[PDB]
Amino acid sequence: PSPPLRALYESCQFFLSGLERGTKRRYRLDAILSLFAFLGGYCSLLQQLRDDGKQQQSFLQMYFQGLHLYTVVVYDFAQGCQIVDLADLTQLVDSCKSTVVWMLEALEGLSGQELTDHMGMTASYTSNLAYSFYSHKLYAEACAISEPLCQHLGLVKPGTYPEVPPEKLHRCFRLQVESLKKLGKQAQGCKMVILWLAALQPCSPEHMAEPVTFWVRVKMDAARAGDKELQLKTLRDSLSGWDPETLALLLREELQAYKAVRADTGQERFNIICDLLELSPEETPAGAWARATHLVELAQVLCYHDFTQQTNCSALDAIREALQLLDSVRPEAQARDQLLDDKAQALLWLYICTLEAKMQEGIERDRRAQFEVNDLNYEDKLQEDRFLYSNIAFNLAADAAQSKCLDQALALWKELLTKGQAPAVRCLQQTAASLQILAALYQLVAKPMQALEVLLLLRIVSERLKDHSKAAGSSCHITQLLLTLGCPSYAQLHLEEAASSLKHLDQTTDTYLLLSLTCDLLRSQLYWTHQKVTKGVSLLLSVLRDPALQKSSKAWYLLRVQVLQLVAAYLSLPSNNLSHSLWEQLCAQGWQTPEIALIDSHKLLRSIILLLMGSDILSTQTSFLDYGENLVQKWQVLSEVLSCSEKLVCHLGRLGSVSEAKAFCLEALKLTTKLQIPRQCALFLVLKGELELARNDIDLCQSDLQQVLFLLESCTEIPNFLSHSPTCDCSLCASPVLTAVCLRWVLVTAGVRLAMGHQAQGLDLLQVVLKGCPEAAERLTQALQASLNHKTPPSLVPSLLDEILAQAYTLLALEGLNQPSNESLQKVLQSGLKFVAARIPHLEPWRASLLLIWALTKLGTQLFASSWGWQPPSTLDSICDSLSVAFRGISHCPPSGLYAHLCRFLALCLGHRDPYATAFLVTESVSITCRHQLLTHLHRQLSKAQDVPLARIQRLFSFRALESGHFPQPEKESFQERLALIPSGVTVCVLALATLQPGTVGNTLLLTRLEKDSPPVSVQIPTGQNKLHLRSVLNEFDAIQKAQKENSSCTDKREWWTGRLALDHRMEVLIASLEKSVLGCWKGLLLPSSEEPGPAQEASRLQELLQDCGWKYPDRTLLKIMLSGAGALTPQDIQALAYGLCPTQPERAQELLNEAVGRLQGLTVPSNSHLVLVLDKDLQKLPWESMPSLQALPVTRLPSFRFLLSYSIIKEYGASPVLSQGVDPRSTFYVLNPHNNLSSTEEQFRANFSSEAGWRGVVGEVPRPEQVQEALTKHDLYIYAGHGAGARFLDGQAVLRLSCRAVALLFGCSSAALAVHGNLEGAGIVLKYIMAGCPLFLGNLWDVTDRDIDRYTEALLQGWLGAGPGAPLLYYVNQARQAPRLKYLIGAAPIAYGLPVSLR
């Protein structure tokens, strides 16, 4: 009784002493006995509460303390639970559940204060027990121990549990809801969430956020599980008789939660918005406000999903209704900050929906909208299409109205956010996201400065929202945009702000790593612009080797794209910077030239865009899944694609490849046509005009310029923009992109005028361009100063404006050469040289061009005649040094036209003083564009791979595979290593034309003979001093071709035949003039040497005497080569040699040479050998093979010297089977009469091609690409007799993809001919065939009139196919030229490309 109760105090003291002894002592199984003792004490406490009648508060506090001690002991036990004590924790939790039921009963009738104190202690004990149980994964036990609490909690009216701790209430509720979700209680979890909401009802909605989030989570789990009844059981029906305003707020919060989740939620949001519309009234301006907000949300939902049938409303109609409602609303002073940014969101989504409608309409419009003799210009015609009228259907004046919405939204948001006071908008998150989308859209439409304004505002929001990741992201974007414009200094402050803000994040999230990598990449870029390349390479290498760059995610892909662009920027630097050690480290990654990196970046961008919006946008032949960041990323990817295309087009146009540049330009034009943006269209049209100018197509360029003028006059809401003042605010002057387009327009117009011969107008226009560029730069500087407000004009602002000025200076100086008398522009060379010298590693090719102009100006002939040893019967030091420093500038990536001029001019200057250097320079000036294309093709093959022959071929062709030092020590070392690799018994001859004027054809021929174990031999032949110049021969050849075309179209055949005979006589005269008037006595350099001893002895003896005779440079090899053919030497050529080499005592030299020829007469036996001819773009047209002296030798022509070495490498690695085993006359595929325009050819060649062995053929129709595919890859002999080479079926790009393993006999009109458009190098299918690795290629050089090509084909085929086991094809090729009636008109057409090929 009372004494026992008094003893119960002593018992409690003893229990406290035991607990002190049991402190940190896990009772384990003895916890059960402790709980039994506690249950006895609880019975005693019930008896005391009966006796209590702080009468009972003291006993309640004692019981609470005992329960707290028991809870602490159970928490320790669960901390040391492991596998076993969990079972003991079950009994402990049963006892604790009995105690919790007792505590809940005691908490009843707690009146006040204790109702928040005793119930608070009960809640704390329950929370501790629940944490211990749930942490032990005892979901069922925790649910059982927590069921009594929330059940009565939720059931009780709002008065109960008043002002209870929301966190404590959340803690139990969150634990129970999480346990239900993990167990998948489904309905039970939803009802518990309902009780959670009911209990917390009298409070502000931020406390309701977590329940709502849990409701959305459980609903979406039901969604993955296929449940829909829960989704039907929405908040409206669930909450039932609740206050409508709270229900509307809860539905809005649920809508935002559904926007957050990463799943497709179109229908759920539609249901929520419809329910919001039903709840809202339409008799109160607050109702109008709610209706407008719901309408803009409905517009967001409908702008991407198709729900028209069940809504009977369009996005535009809904958004216009919302706009009218918003404009009608009269606000209240405290809530104006919501009407602002409500209007802004509405206008922005209006713009987005109108753009989407335009895109869909254009896609549908474009989708439903859908026999010349030579095929030289087939790919050009195929590339070109008719879409210029679409541009007229493109520049509608609705664009100003469309952009007005975005401008007004920006203005309203600026007014909202500028003021210092914290914004009162309910959700700043959505404002920040919409600001990001607006900035992306502004970038996409080529309005950069306005986009920067938005980004500054986004950072302001990040500070208010205290979210550190977005501050770093926005600062990185700001720095990237600032550097793209060309302001180096203003990038650094924002970069440092990003670096400072980066620190406040956990160092394990992907965000931290991505931001750190981006900042390091930006630092590397900033070093590149500030001449710190040495550590920039280190930073770039550390970024590249980092394994986290390869993680599969869309955010990392854009970082990879930017890294690739920076790699391309680094790969465009002269070898003086860095060092040898870092160069192969950089090249070891797998990118050897900037264009390779740019192409990889473009491919990555296309792959990214493929994953986001399908593929209908890019080309004509899924769902968007708006997810948050996807909306921003779409516009970002489109803008990046456009910028990458612009860079690629500019670089490829500069290099000298025009076909690829035109392809990229047309693709970009199509893309800009679909989106309906005139500003980008104008820039790409101007670039296309510039590309067309280089091909000499004046009218097409003029049409494109007219289109540019029409578009410029369309958006401006002799052209008028030339008269603008230096300072202006018009749309053309306010924006830098438009200013760049306008400045390019005048350059292209001046180029066209100069081409047409209208001089003195092009100079006038180019003066305008030169004057205009710096003033535009200064206006851009002022504009950037106003926006960013640092109030300090930042250093310099280099940009694309610099390149425009450089090219303008180049063209002005080049025009200066042709008119030497005008002093006013004779200082432009100096001015441009100073201007370029300022930016050394940025305008190097332009510096090289200006230096070449300076050298040719100082040229003022016999000036180069003291370096060679044959004269036809110090300034040099300065020219050599200047040309050397110009050569080292562009060696790493030379333009295809300036390199040849530099190389051949320097080779002329050096002369026989350094034979090795002269030979290297002459060899390094032929077929450079082919070398670039082969490097790109090799990279494509190697990338397809995931090899050793490919690696060695890459080393042989790379521009940087050499050591360091002076000029030309590494060049000579590499050249000697190449020379040691020459196959035996092969003599290589290079014929190139030395051009003085960099636009015309010269009159100097350079000849080089390269041989194994022999020093190189070089010589120069001037042809301007004698009649019958080289240009005379070229003009006569062109005249003969045009006369043949004229004579082809006639009716009477008498005149036809007479004209044909006269033309044949003219061609014979031309062929004779080639040998007897151009080469002269030096025909012997193209003949095989001698192996019998005795010519060497005679050469040595003659050398000793001729040294005294007056030979300025004595060479034994020259005499050996000339005397190896002593039999064919005529008296006149002997006189020419003696007079040229020996001007001191010509008479004695003539006598000695005559005696030497007499001694060597007869005892000459030239033997097996092979000659390779390397010709430049102008000499390739002439038939060198049909000279009388060369009509007895095997001759083939190759694009360059490195190709022979590549053939040797392939033969050593045993890839090519033809040059190892021999063309087998069993695998033949012939194409006869694709389109039936020929009749007699079929009749003649049908039987001759039918009755054979293994001759698969197709005759009558056009072969499908698969057949020719397998006929070129797998067969051995491919023959085509149709008109043209066949580019209609197998275009060059299809050929490049293959491996060529056959010999192609193309018997068509101009099959082997290379098209020379302007100053560009030759282009043809033969080049692609050689790139694919063709052992031999045969084709005609000029157009043929048929009926004699028949006889030539018959003779050649019969002879070579009936030869026998094995014979050289070149012998029968030379023997078959006598069959036709016209021996020089049709017999001289065929030529051979490749290496000699024989049968088994």
Ligand SMILES: [Zn+2]
């Ligand atoms: Zn203006």
